[PDB]
Amino acid sequence: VRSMTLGNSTITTQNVVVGYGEWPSYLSTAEDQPTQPDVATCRFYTLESVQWEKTSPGWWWKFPEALKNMGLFGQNMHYHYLGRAGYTIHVQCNASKFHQGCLLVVCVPEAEMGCADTDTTFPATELTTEDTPHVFTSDSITGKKVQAAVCNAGMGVGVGNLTIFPHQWINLRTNNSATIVIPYINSVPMDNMFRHYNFTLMIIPFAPLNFTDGATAYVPITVTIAPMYAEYNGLRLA
Amino acid sequence: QTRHVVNFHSRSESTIENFMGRAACVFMDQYKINGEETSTDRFAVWTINIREMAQLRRKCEMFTYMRFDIEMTMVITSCQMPVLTHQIMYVPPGGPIPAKVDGYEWQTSTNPSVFWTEGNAPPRISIPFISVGNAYSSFYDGWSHFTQDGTYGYTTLNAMGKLYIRHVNRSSPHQITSTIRVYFKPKHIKAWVPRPPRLCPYINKRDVNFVVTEITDSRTSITD
Amino acid sequence: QTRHVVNFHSRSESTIENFMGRAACVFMDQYKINGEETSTDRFAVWTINIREMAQLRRKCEMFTYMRFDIEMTMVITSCQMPVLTHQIMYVPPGGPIPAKVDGYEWQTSTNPSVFWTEGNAPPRISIPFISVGNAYSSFYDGWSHFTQDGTYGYTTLNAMGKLYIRHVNRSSPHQITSTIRVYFKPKHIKAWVPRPPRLCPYINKRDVNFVVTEITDSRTSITD
Amino acid sequence: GVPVLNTPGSNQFLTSDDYQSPSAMPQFDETPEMHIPGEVRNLMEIAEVDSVVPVNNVTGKTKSMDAYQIPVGDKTKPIFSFQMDPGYSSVLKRTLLGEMLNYYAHWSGSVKLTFLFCGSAMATGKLLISYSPPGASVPTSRKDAMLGTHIVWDIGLQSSCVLCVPWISQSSAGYITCWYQTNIVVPPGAPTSCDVLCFASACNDFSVRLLRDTPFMA
Amino acid sequence: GVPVLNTPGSNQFLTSDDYQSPSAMPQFDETPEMHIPGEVRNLMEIAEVDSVVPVNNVTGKTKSMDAYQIPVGDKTKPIFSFQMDPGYSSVLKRTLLGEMLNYYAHWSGSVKLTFLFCGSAMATGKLLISYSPPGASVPTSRKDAMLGTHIVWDIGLQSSCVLCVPWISQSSAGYITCWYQTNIVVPPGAPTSCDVLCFASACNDFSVRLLRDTPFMA
Amino acid sequence: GVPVLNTPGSNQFLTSDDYQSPSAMPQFDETPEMHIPGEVRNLMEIAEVDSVVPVNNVTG
């Protein structure tokens, strides 16, 4: 049991999957100069806990803008139009000892998702609802929204071989916590934080939750994101 | 066939340059020589992108980011005279395009073009890594216009240019219908961020939309 | 499009040789093969000057003085027989010119000429720095004839020669109309005395005359 | 000048050549290469990643995520059974292993399988994972599977048993059957029926030769 | 002799090549190069020269030299305001900076601005020159411009204030507004209304990549 | 570039030549050579083997 703290946010934790073997870092010019906030930004932003029932198909969050209303990090998105960060993501499950199940906690950089009825697009409020997660579905759906059927998560790939990305299994038999560090994968050193979704944290239950008639009918999944090494553009003159 | 002892130890054919760097025909098109002075059927266009045919498109979607020089060689035929000379004008991403076979854009000094006359070896034109960013992005989970406007998934970083092709001969006594086959080839290719293979069939050449497909082929029971 | 982080540090594309040294088509012309034994439509002329088309002319007027070798490659077509052979005769500034397709000047040993037969690679002829002075002058604030006579602005130092082009075939059964496209290219170029860019549109190809144009595009108020 | 003579093969266009292409934009200087995380330098780095194998791909359970779940909790018939070849096998053909192997005609190597038991932390039982050599016939009973190659995988102690199946190549393969050694013993609070996930990758190193076009795309 | 074979790309004419052209006049020896003053060895030596910027380019003042003059001498609306991008901006597109940048598609660097106050030697006042970052909105008031980036430029002490605006590139830009901090205080002899000239060049060093044809010429 | 001139015999196909053929499968790496018993490196190693001679090859 390790009680990590960052700024004015302390969580209680119980091995880290460093995404692509790299730890996030700063970009290191007088023509373009970055600003490193360091202060705040790095604290833990615990999202709303998500109840995992027997019939839950999955969830996804789209970052960096899932934190668009989260404190100073969600406020520096409105004043600077360029930025980058690292996003240590803790995922606890705090189930009991009689609950069973298994989760895939994967990050999927550049998850370009497909519309539900092709030949058209979706109204841009179907990919993300800032803090709250869009759930997947168990079967196919229609309408101007994301094709959120599992087995074809968002991208038209098999959902089983989604393990190629930075992932972590949460088997309630053994463990309950996951932690992933995603060192800002992008093709340009800095990009706008409202246009571009750098990665898509999606939690997918492979083995479904099961229990008997006495336990609690759900297992709350707690998501915590710490934006590390966040740096922005400069606002001062040179 | 029979199961033989396939005994060897090699992964030189599994590297990225030995997997992607293969020439494939990506653009057939017809273009005439005479008649209809204001027509769009006297030249070819082909905006250069990797999402041309699904066999190559599938390989570029193994990887999220990749950068590579392209080295295309056209194979130009003709049907129905003099000896014919062609022009394959590559315009960069920032470049004026012709509207007609006799536009002034064809004479632009910043648009490099090859003048291949018939009978010789095929014309080869090589284009470096043009993009503004540091790699071409196969996938772009983002919006071109800020504040979640239209045009999902299309970034302007992975723009490669266009390829305008015409006869340089002004006219002809009879009709000559030339056919061009552009052979695209990635070169000096690097690739980042692997990605699971495509499962569903492709719908359209500018989006990732799909129909929900089954994972694998089904069998009768779990034990057979 | 969107505003990206255009991060790099390079000015190799802004040097003079990487700015001026680009091949651009500067002369289209027709010339027949037979008929009208005394005619001016059986050969081409094109007195070589930088003031050919306004796109290139604008770049040469960034600089007052410049010196450069020129390396032009013609692209010759034909319409309507045997295999055709052409002749591209460059006469120096001091050189006799033909008056007809069958003049004796074509046989002058001091006028270098290429004999390109059809079907091969395009003919390339390179011309060194001919001028009498030490540089070509884009602008000449002076009078050719002493004591302020006629012909303002035309010096004889920036004379480059002429380019007479004909078929060498004496006749043909039918009519063949060849088209030539001269691709001018400065080479090994140096440039002195920078100069502000042209603002007004060009009027004529031998003078600097202009119509008074507005400085920039107008807007509504000073603060919008 | 230099007396040259053109050989057969001059002025032709061989599709697979590696000649110096004349660059169309010579003045142009390309963007400097930044370090982007997660570079791939070899395709067989994708095959070495574990990924979930749809063992329960029966006729009505392939468009859901019930394809990946092996139901555990009749001791006379095996739990599951499948051909051990990533090509031409419905179970292992759309795996990351089995999908980077359909780009090639000649491949040879070994393949490791991980069985993650996704049941309760109180459920306890034994499963017997038998392997048949590529020529042998499948075991029809649990005893005949015990007399061959097997691993009696105690679930209550460890929850993940790893194999490494050799002699996997094409240019008539093995079998991974699984048997009830014991039933799943469970206290009154925990549920009775559990699931077992499977995984597959390249075990140590994988050999692969002749590139071709994939059959899946049409 | 030497067995050669022609590759694809033989006997073609690529417009952008750098081959050895056979010289037509080989005997001819060209004139010796004298030293002429003022050699240009790089285009970005033209962009580094200051030149007057037509800020007052309103609908009827662009064919006169009233385009270059910012009238100084209502404190609620700013004196002038313009986009800070030398391309696609009416104020900075025909500058020496903005005109050598329309020959190129990719350019990135910084840009310095000099405000020469061309009033009397007795006129005294303050002007507040605010800069908005490329994402931010313009200040609607003088106080909101004071809370951002600004320089309270005292005219009576110094008559030329120099900026250096970074993050200037294309492949939604900044703003240089100017405000009356104080009015122009003037003795009885000197005139009341003054002018402010502006300038623009490359601040330290400028990066520029992809050559194209200019849009202005038709 | 280099001034070359084609001799007589250019662009012909002599059947018995030993020129460098451009390989169609350059990426392809061929199977390693194992040792197989009984290599022949010269035809006259077959002539040196005794073999029975049909001397009594009469008409029937």
Author numbering:
A (entry chain B): 13 to 26, 30 to 43, 48 to 257
B (entry chain A), C (entry chain A): 43 to 122, 132 to 275
D (entry chain C), E (entry chain C): 1 to 73, 78 to 175, 187 to 233
F (entry chain C): 1 to 60
From the paper:
Viruses from the family Picornaviridae form non-enveloped icosahedral virions that are about 30 nm in diameter. The capsid proteins VP1, VP2, VP3, and VP4 originating from a single polyprotein form a protomer, the basic building block of the icosahedral capsid. The entire capsid consists of 60 such protomers, arranged in 12 pentamer units. Here we show that the exit of the RNA from the particles of echoviruses 18 and 30 requires capsid opening and results in a loss of up to three adjacent capsid protein pentamers.
The interactions of enteroviruses with receptors or exposure to acidic pH in endosomes induce conformational changes in virions into an activated state characterized by increased particle diameter, reduced contact areas between pentamers of capsid protein protomers, release of VP4 subunits from particles, and externalization of the N termini of VP1 subunits. Receptor binding or exposure to acidic pH induces the transformation of native virions into activated particles with reduced inter-pentamer interfaces. The conversion of echovirus 18 virions to activated particles occurred in <3 min after exposure to acidic pH at 37 °C, however some of the particles also released their RNA and aggregated. The electron density of the genomes is distributed uniformly in echovirus 18 virions at neutral pH, but transforms to a grainy appearance in activated particles at acidic pH. The inter-pentamer contacts of 11,000 Å2 in native echovirus 18 virion are reduced to 5400 Å2 in the activated particles. Correspondingly, the interaction between two pentamers in an activated particle of echovirus 18 is 25% weaker than that in a native virion. The weakening of the inter-pentamer contacts together with the changes in the genome organization, probably enable the opening of the activated particles for genome release. Comparing the cryo-EM images of native virions with activated particles of echovirus 18, as well as other enteroviruses, reveals that their genomic RNAs undergo conformational changes upon exposure to acidic pH. During the shift from neutral to acidic pH, the side chains of histidines of capsid proteins, and probably also parts of the genomic RNA, become protonated, and thus acquire more positive charge. The changes in the charge distribution and putative release of the polyamines from virions may result in the observed changes in the genome structure and increased pressure on the capsid from the inside.
